[PDB]
Amino acid sequence: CGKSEAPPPAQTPEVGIVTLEAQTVTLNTELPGRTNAFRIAEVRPQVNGIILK
Amino acid sequence: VSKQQYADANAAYLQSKAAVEQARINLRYTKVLSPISGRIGRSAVTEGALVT
Known part of the structure; x- marks a missing residue:
């Protein structure tokens, strides 16, 4: 029959960054x-x- | 001169010395000397104010 459709498990998702510095x-x-x-x-x-x- | 006249004269002299001391106290009062040593705040009255 079939119809399994395994998605890719490993993602390591995206985040938003800012790089703070001295001020x-x-x-x-x-x-x-x-x-x-x-x-x-x-x-x-x-x-x-x-x-x- | 008699000893009684000298005893009266120096008595009048010391009474006049006490009177000029009494005047010196009131002259000392018009310069308000600080009674203790410490931090002073701010003046509640300014120049031109009448005190009592």
């Missing part, structure tokens, strides 16, 4: 913050009395 990287972060003035002076009086002008 320099800079590590940098990003942090929140507020802006402040260089000098702030709160004008407070040093005597007592009515503001005339």
